[model samples]
Target: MAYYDALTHLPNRTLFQDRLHTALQQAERNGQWVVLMFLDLDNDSLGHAAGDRMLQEVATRLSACVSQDDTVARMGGDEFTLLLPSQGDREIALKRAIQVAELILGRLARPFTLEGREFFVTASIGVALSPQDGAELSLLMKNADTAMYHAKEMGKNNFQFYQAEMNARALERLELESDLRRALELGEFVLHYQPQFTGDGRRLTGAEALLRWQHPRRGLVPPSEFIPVLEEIGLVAQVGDWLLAEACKQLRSWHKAKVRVPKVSVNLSARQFADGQLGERIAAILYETGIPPACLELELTESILMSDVAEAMQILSGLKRLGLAIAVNNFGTGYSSLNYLKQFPIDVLKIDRSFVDGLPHGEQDAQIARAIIAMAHSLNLMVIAEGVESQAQLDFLREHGCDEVQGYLFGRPMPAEQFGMLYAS
Candidate 1:
């Protein structure tokens, strides 16, 4: 029987399974342990001829690292496995698995001379121990494969041992990605506006439109939980387009009803700001919504503004031409570059609530808050402190000439219908 691959002359999947099948029974009777290692290689960097040559060398290197009794198998292209059925119990299996995995990594890292040229390749490996992982041969193999791919995800050229949690998290993320695709299609997203008031906490200056995923079964999913997934899947721009249109439509309706709301600010994600036609898109929305340009504010973080100086200058200046106010959302949290700050067409400098949470009581935070307000004033930028939950914080900001403020002390983010009652009451 040709149990090994015809190309590499190494054991194939069938032989690997056949050997594993019988090894577990003997291990159970003798109270020993078994470890299976799955390795993924970057050997396919060239044509099939180059791949075959590299696999031959890799097989040679792998075989040399193991004992005579140990099993080395090549199941498929770039997939190799080592079956270490050792004499002792768990420690024996665990230590032996680690030893062989590291040896394979070192060997793979070394340069290979191929077709008169030196080439370098790396490997990602996964280790799964028997009885601890599973008794079934298929189950152990699957777990080891999962661990190998996890290594790939963890930046490749590394090794990972399978854990139950790894499988659970992987499954969860898979479901989240699939569900988010459905979420965008089903219109299961919405904007909740949180009111921003004057420093004295009376006049309504503006409200921030915060995104919330209206998940069908899980109730409302917070942005902190779902936004990264949305961004990871590259849906932020699409969702942001809808958000701008919806927020402006709401503002337009408010003006039609004579609600007297000053402005509505919408957050711009990194992807949204980086979009090449961001200026054109915002201008189109403004023209379509029939709302005054001054009635809508765009909130951007310092990180977004400072990411690229020349590009940001172009985008900001164009937005300024559209006549909407541009506010820095989390003021001191990002690059906080005073030099770039003066260059951009920024009108409002928002003092993020982390500093405000400390208020006039927290010593360093108070000093920082004082300095931010003074600096914003000197630059002719209106300062808005976010997350003001107490009178003490408000009093501190008001005492320091802070121009605007937003926090739960004023109002929590609420739906558009609830916000209507806010303007009414």
Candidate 2:
């Protein structure tokens, strides 16, 4: 009975995997097409009972939709697998698969009678064909699952076939994810400090702690390459915790060395902001490292601040009470209102890199930058323009009442030891 799902009365993962193995073997010999499909239902807001009822009805409909030779199985909660065997060739098989997918989507979109209450839900399906998608059961399943996730990302209620590029991208993502996890385990991640200077560009007021991966084989891997993947895999919080502690410890070391760097800024993700223990964690790190909260600046994106305005206000209030300065990173890139901006305890606004990149060359960008600096000043918030490279850009920013700047115009982000030396010089 364990081989079958109790809720849907369909074959479970064990049985499904078993059947898939057999199908692959038969398709390899007969040169016929075998379609493997992974379907996921959206039931986030619905209760468990409602989801269970929905799943059962979905299984019945799936069984009805397929031919007698086809097999439908429940892989787990809200996920089902399908095996459509013996289609003649790739073209015919793909066409038939699309027809079946459309049928499934239409059937599932209708109202579901669950517990005497009507509910509506949609399905995301990923399809993989034999020999083309993969010859092995596990490989095909993985590719199909990746395609299913792609469908979900495409706003759900759709289906996608496993493409060669999809598999390649999936493999690349997996390799990077594995390497990132290993990088954390082996202490391969190092922090580089990017100097932030006053409007005059004479002195370093603070530096931002930027994470870099020092891969043994690849040498230095850029943060732009791995940071998004870390966030996607739900590893940002764990890595962020380490980043905070390490940055604070480094700041303490610099203070001991008599470096005049006033503060260090650490970027915080939306996940970290939503974490209830954010203040507690920061407090613990400060106490453990003996670094004053004032020496550690937390940089947040405008989107994170706007995510839950009321909750963000509370968090920002707590952080302000803790004596740490808060700045909105990538300011103009997100939707932020002056009315709500005044409510948060923000000290600085960092103009997005895009706006800075356009500089004096693009009048529209110059006007936007000018407006941001003026708005920030009127609201009593300091302004920092990022990605300042050329003298023209720097001059424009300085002329526009911007308070601080950070980019290649100052210096690219460098290792902690190098930064320390720069400070000493």
What is the TM-score of each predicted model, taking all chains together?
Answer: 0.67, 0.66
In terms of TM-score, the best-performing candidate is: 1
Instruction: Provide the lDDT at 115 for model 1.
Output: 79
- Candidate 2 lDDT tens digits, 117-217: 78888899999988888998989999999989988998778888888553455457668989988888898888889989988787888989998889998
Best model per lDDT: 2
Regions of candidate 1 where Cα sits further than 4 Å from its true position: 1-37, 40-161, 331-336
In candidate 1, what are the lDDT values of residues 1-425, reduced to their tens digit? Answer: 67779878888989988888778877888777888889988733455666978889999999999987889999887889988885597656765776687788898888888877888888999988888898878899888888888888987677788975534554576688788889878989988989888888878888789998899887898788789878866889989999999999998887678576778998888888889888788889988988888988888888888788788888888889989888886656323465569988888888887889898789789888888888788889989998889889999898889998888888689998889778763
Model 1: ten consecutive residues of lowest lDDT: 331-340
Each candidate structure's count of clashing pairs: 0, 0
The root-mean-square deviation over C-alpha atoms between each candidate and the true structure, in angstroms, is 12.6, 13.6
What are the lDDT figures for the candidates, one per model? 0.83, 0.85
